[PDB]
Amino acid sequence: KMKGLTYTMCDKTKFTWKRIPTDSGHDTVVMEVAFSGTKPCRIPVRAVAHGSPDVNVAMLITPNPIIENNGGGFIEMQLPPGDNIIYVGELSHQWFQKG
């Protein structure tokens, strides 16, 4: 079963990193975010090929990423080569993908 598909989307303003986007060595990117609302909610995660904001290119490895009353901040994803911007609502981080 998919957990929390009926949860509220999180407030896009209320994110911070705990751990900035990082290459895992498996072509995936890993990260962790904190969220500051007192809530269980669905994380608004996406990524953009730089200069093309319309097409979301985030292939998540963590499907339907969710923050819970304890736990949930960690996200893993895969991205196309070249410049990308990762977003977690209003958080963003320019990511360059190798090869």
- The binding site for a second copy (CB under 8 A) comprises 5-9, 16-18, 20, 34, 36, 50-56, 90-91, 94
Cβ proximity of 62 and 74 under 8 Å:
yes
Return the number of the residue (24 or 94) whose C-beta is nearest a second copy: 94
Whole-angstrom Cα distance, residue 99 to residue 97?
7
Residue number, 26 or 55, with CB nearest to a second copy: 55
**Nearest distance, CB of residue 86 and a second copy, angstroms:** 13
26 or 34: whose CB is closer to a second copy? 34
Sheet (strand 28-35) strand order: 15-23, 28-35, 74-78, 59-60
The minimum distance between CB 17 and a second copy, in angstroms, equals 6
Question: Minimum CB separation from a second copy for residue 60, in Å?
Answer: 11
Helix, strand, coil percent values for the chain (each to nearest 5) = 0, 55, 45
